[PDB]
Design a protein around this ligand. Sequence first.
Ligand SMILES: *[C@@]([C])([C][O])[C@](*)(=O)[C]([C]C1=[C][C]=[C][C]=[C]1)[N]C(=O)[C]([C]C1=[C][N]C2=C1[C]=[C][C]=[C]2)[N]C(=O)[C]([C])[N]C(=O)C1=C([C])C2=C([C]1)[C]=[C][C]=[C]2
Ligand SMILES: [Mg+2]
Ligand SMILES: [Mg+2]
Ligand SMILES: [Mg+2]
Ligand SMILES: [Mg+2]
Lengths: 233, 211, 204, 195, 195, 226, 196, 196, 222
Amino acid sequence: TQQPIVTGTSVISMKYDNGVIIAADNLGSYGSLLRFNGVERLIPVGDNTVVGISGDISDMQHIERLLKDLVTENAYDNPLADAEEALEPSYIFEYLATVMYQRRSKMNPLWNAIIVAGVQSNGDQFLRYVNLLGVTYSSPTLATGFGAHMANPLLRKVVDRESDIPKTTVQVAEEAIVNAMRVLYYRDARSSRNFSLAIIDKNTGLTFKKNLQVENMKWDFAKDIKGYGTQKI
Amino acid sequence: TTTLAFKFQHGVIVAVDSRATAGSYISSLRMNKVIEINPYLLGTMSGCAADCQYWERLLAKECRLYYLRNGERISVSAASKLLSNMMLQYRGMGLSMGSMICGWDKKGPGLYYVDDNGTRLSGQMFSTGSGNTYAYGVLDSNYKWDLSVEDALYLGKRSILAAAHRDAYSGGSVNLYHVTEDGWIYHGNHDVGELFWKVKEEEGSFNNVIG
Amino acid sequence: SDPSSINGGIVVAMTGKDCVAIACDLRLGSQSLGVSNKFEKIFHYGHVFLGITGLATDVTTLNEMFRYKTNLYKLKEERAIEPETFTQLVSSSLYERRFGPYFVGPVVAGINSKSGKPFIAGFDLIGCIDEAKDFIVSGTASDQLFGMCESLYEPNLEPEDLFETISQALLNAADRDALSGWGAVVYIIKKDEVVKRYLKMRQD
Amino acid sequence: MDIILGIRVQDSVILASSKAVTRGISVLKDSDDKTRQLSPHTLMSFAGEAGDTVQFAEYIQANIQLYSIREDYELSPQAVSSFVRQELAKSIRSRRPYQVNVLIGGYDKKKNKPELYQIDYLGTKVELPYGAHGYSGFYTFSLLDHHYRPDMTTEEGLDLLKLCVQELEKRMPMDFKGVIVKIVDKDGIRQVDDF
Amino acid sequence: MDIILGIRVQDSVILASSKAVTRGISVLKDSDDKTRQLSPHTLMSFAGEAGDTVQFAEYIQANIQLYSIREDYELSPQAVSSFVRQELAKSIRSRRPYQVNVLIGGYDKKKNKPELYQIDYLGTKVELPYGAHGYSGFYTFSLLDHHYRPDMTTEEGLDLLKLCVQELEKRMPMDFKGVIVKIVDKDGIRQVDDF
Amino acid sequence: TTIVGVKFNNGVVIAADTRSTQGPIVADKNCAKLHRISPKIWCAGAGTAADTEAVTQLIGSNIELHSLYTSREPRVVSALQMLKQHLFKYQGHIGAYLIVAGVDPTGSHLFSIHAHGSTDVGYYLSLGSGSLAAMAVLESHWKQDLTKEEAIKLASDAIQAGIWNDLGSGSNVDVCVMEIGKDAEYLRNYLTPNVREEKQKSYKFPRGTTAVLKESIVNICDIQEE
Amino acid sequence: TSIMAVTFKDGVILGADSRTTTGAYIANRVTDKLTRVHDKIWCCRSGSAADTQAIADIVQYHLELYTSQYGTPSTETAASVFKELCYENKDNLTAGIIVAGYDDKNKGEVYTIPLGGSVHKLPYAIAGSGSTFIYGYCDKNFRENMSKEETVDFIKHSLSQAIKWDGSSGGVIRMVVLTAAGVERLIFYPDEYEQL
Amino acid sequence: TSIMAVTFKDGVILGADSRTTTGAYIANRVTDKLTRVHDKIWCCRSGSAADTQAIADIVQYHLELYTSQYGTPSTETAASVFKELCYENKDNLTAGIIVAGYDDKNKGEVYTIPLGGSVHKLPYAIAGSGSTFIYGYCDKNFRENMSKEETVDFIKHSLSQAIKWDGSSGGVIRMVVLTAAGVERLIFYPDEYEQL
Amino acid sequence: QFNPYGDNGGTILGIAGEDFAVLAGDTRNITDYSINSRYEPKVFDCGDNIVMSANGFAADGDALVKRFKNSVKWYHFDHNDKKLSINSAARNIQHLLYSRRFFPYYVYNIIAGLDEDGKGAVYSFDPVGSYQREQCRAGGAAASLIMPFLDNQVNFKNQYEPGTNGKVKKPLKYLSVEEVIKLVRDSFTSATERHIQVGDGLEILIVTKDGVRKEFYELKRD
Ligand SMILES: *[C@@]([C])([C][O])[C@](*)(=O)[C]([C]C1=[C][C]=[C][C]=[C]1)[N]C(=O)[C]([C]C1=[C][N]C2=C1[C]=[C][C]=[C]2)[N]C(=O)[C]([C])[N]C(=O)C1=C([C])C2=C([C]1)[C]=[C][C]=[C]2
Ligand SMILES: [Mg+2]
Ligand SMILES: [Mg+2]
Ligand SMILES: [Mg+2]
Ligand SMILES: [Mg+2]
């Protein structure tokens, strides 16, 4: 049993017609202190999977190392390590899910919420969630922390059920994700303007975008707001 | 729950209710609270349902192995003691079990009360569960050694009915058993709803209740 | 310990076609112990019916209180109180004890003598009104009653059909609750006749 | 205190109340009368927290006696029971509630009927053919459910009461030092000196 | 369990132990024998937490019986009491201590003397002319202090023991359902079937 | 509960869902959370349901008497001030979280108020368990100089977000529009996207199915003449 | 919250962020924490919003009544009314208030009233959860008798850093300028102050 | 405690105060918080003195043994050994460590290891109870590729403010300069840094 | 302090027919007042004509099902591809649950299939391993809403024959698969109305001698 110290906030994601998108901000908070501003919380595994992690950063760095070691171990005595016997998103997720549930069962959890986004060998989209309790679920949209409360409602307006996935393009999906990240910046006190975004497409592969910023923000209406009720000046 | 068991001239009667509760919610209307360890051994269940089922079924394994090793049926005294020693291994770990081990052996009919503390008592008459007080009232005033099989079966049945009526956590149906030297004999499942109205009319009891 | 579940009990009310029904169990207990099988939880002030579940002392106390208030209402107004008006009186009376409340779940049922419109309503212990068209439930088997009412109920039922629906809703909910049962009563209410039926049920 | 029982038969009400009073680990008294006559045809037995019981009973007694003198008339058992219930219901929301449970046995001279009322410290009133407070009912109600008839004589009521006390004496871990039994009927209140 | 008494007279040791066994609010048994014969001339009565008492007593019994067979010799009461004390003193610092209090009554055949040892669950041993555990001594020791002589007969010891039980039955709030009395002397152990 | 308030060109609009709960159980599927303080001042409340009603009725009563005393139409700032001072006095023990909106001779107003007595000003607000789902919609689509029709759409869209994505919110959408120089229009059940489907079976019983012991006529009439 | 008040040559300037949180949720991102108790006596509020609003409302009432009887009150007098409320009700309040005002006689004055209800007259004051991160910056960069433009830059840079490090602070930077000329409201948006 | 490490053109400089408290009592006013784990790899310690001393001693042992087998270890390697200890024993430790070292290949590097056992490579780092008060100052005044004298002034001014506001910090300002030239120890007394 | 348990909501329902059995469950997965997924399968085909659902804490539910599926695999290996009978599966599951008596699988488990005589069978478990064969059982969040309805409409409780007035009960006539599915759909539609954790979708697994068939139905998404 522990308590999280340095933490990362929401990770948000969604499926679209040819793949998946995942995003997360670059902040490492120390309680209310916005301590670290250059933290990458999306971690690619090969060219077909991106693991997005929220929660305790020391535990994230530990998981990051397990995944790096997983790639190394899979290549051992494996001539098809960069082909048929390469790591799949489903393999990577189930490994993490196994670890998370074992750790909670020893009453010593990895204090995280993880989303594994990727594309399988057969082109199928993979998107599944796992957390410190070992709880797993899948959905056309997935989000952690505040993202679950604010991002999912916006993303579910684009992909409300399974049949909406083929009708959703990458431009529309990315637009929805970027808008959601702006909304979180407005309303999440533990968020930052700077974020990273990753797209895993079955045709164009893995596109990893760094140093993105929330833009087109509305603040002008603030000038007119005065007092808390009766004050006019 | 309410359970009872008593020795008499023609063996031992065993009667239990069938209710199961999860708080104030009645989770089960008909649960089997007797276990048939062997043709001559019975076990009642009160407390945690899982604990009762697991450990008494494990007792049956151990009583069965006794027969294979010794070519002979285990005594009620020895069977009850094996169970009490199991309870003593998980001492203070939070098991909740109250059972009566009923049977017939070379000493005649045998009846032993056993609980999670490891308590093991020999006796003529026992009753366990939330409604045992109501059952004891009927048993104590109507029990004799000189009871007939027919009257004894009714006493245990009527004693459960008494508890099922008053105790909120007892009811559903009554399961009856009669243990002889030729083995135990099941005497059926009796719905309390139907049994109550029947007894009220025939016996004249429960006058305060309207029907 | 929980005052709302010491004595046990349930009340349910339904609307029908030009009629209403309200029913209750008869049990009163001290937790596991059954004490009385004649503790009726439904009262009437003129043509307005009130069912109350929860702590028995408060049930008794509130009946005596609403009898007090409706009798004065009648002397001054020179007419019997109506269900809509009584509902507001109950809500008002409960909220005046906001920080030391009666541990009850009241249910109002009746027909407006002028409009002829059937009316039911429920409250929380603090006075929040639930003016439902279909049905109202209260008591230790409220979850059970919600399931039964929601599946068995259909609108515009005739009195003799409504009777069967509400009775089965109560009976089967009570049979899945340890703290409810020991008898049951059903009131069938029409604009100028009221029938009261005691049901036969299992006594465990 | 602990055990108080009550039974209403054909033409009377019988109340049985334990004699023991305990303080610490010592039984200070084994002949205590846990009852007060409220009026010539109304008796109230009581059980609860030490000190509160007698104070409450005597306070009720004073109020009913005051009423009797003022009106030159005896209140019905029903009226007395309702007065007592209200006082307890008033008490439960007080700063320091009175922790007293009572049985009220009375003979209504107007209706020519015996009446038994059970009231707990919360103000929970019920009219019953037989009643008890605390754990007493757990042992005794099964016997009463079986043997009780409404046309029983006073003698049959006493015999059924003996059976209840015997069951209590067998299955309770508590030594309550026997009971004092009192009968309430048309002729008033009397004590059974041999029980 | 509750009350266990012991008294050492001229030529014997007398142990009296209650018969009641309670579970919840119900007395399950009123004929329970709270004692084990450790050897032909050594008897141990016991009282404490449910289940632990019998398990401890039977474990001690097995060890002493094992010793008797191995050496073809009966250990002195003093030796047995010391063995029992050590087991309890060992137990009190265990993960889960055995909550058992005992009286050991034995007749030493070598010295031709009766001996009574009182040992509590902590492993606190004392040799006494008379002893008790729990609250039993609070009621009885004043009588024993007054009436006890070391030259008393077995019959006089039983009469003084009756007086102790009568005092317990009067002033305890607890119904312990009488006592089983056993005598330990040169001829061995026997039970007084009428008490 | 999900509630919103949105300002527009010539007025203000509020909206709410219609679900009330007892823990995980739905007590009322068509609750009315839009309350009237005065004809053109409406509020909507989350939290303890009895508190939001009681405090709304009380202030509304005192507002009416104030309006009569001053021969003037009630102002939203008056309701706001009277509410917060009442709630502050009870130090959060009255669990009323409200969105207050209205029009008066001063103009159109929109306030939020919390149970401890703090008030806020805004062009768009949201309260309740579905506030975050609704605010995400408001932050995505709200703009300056909205029309009446755009604001109603934004408001109901924000409530829908709560209905679908928040378990504490559900059923229907209620709306009230308060425009300057007009009567306020209360649009009860403006949207009805959660109608129960037809059941597969009818559970109407045969007459006589239920066992009966006694029957009796209940005398509800008064004592009769002659 | 990040609030500050700074005296300068021509008077005094109050400054504040606009973020109000309920845990990690931003309940209001455009809050006005600069509140008027008199024409040229304003305050900055920190702590419980319910408590600080109730206090400022009561103070505004006292100063309106003071003015009707005795004329325009001093900034010291306004701070005393705040103090009397904060001190005597310290067990039931959580309020950290900075009082700032302009007289023609006394010019620009600043009083800070922390949790206990003590009063401290200062050249400048900082308060709120974000103030901790700028104690060093403000101490190093503050000078007496600065110009209006220098003082605006000082507050802007200071609150910029407080917002940068404190998650409980953010949004826009509001400012109120109190001089003989009158009362000027200022606002500065993220795209301006973030790039400093 | 107030500690910091800053990279610059020629290498890296560690800085720290010298105050150790037991509540409000100053148990040691001349503490040396700059501790050597290798020739040119030093660390700054914050948190439990027992925990941080025990860790630094173990790390020093690991790096001495590393050196005997594999040659001079990198600063990254040293930070990894600190991390592995702080992370795997996080439930029983209270240690906030800043690691700083000089290579000829990698030059000056700084790693900070806060409570949880996470690692963060930075241009400069601040830690300890007094660091809170200089987040704004350090962010505004830090530049990359400063000179030795510029960096010494930056640390001196920064820790001066931390000491000024934090009661848990104080005494002298110790510094350690890590370059190709070697290892230089510096000290600055109150009469020097207080008047800044 | 770390709480190793959680509540993922959901509700399940098992009904045993004369020569068939059904195991139904909603597809909604939740924490507190949020929806995790509108379609997260909860009822699984475990092989050997056995279906299973572990309702409550999803992590423990997935672990148990995973372990039972594994137990079926090793039963084939160890006992010459013998079919695991429903009664044998039930007893095996008891021992899987009780292996964690002191750190329980926080789930209410139900299995369904056919007995060795070809008749419909449902077995139901508590978190610690008490089990028993039943005709009808609802489990999970809205179990208390559904069970009384099933007592009334499946076992005809409190129902008597008109004209007799309580003297003669309604006879216990058997139900067809089409009749059972109607009662299942109405149970979940009613539960969805009054329980906030129930909704989104309903998935039913029907078991006959021919095999395991699936049926899906939409539920209200509010
Ligand atoms: C009386 C009904 C009440 O105590 C009786 O003791 C029964 C005994 C019993 C024995 C064997 C089988 C069934 C019942 N006890 C229970 O019903 C117990 C009481 C209890 C609840 N918690 C608890 C208890 C006792 C001691 C410690 C803690 N109830 C249970 O064990 C609960 C947990 N079980 C169930 O509600 C369910 C069971 C069993 C079951 C369920 C639910 C579903 C499907 C199959 C079995
Ligand atoms: Mg019962
Ligand atoms: Mg001793
Ligand atoms: Mg200092
Ligand atoms: Mg919803």
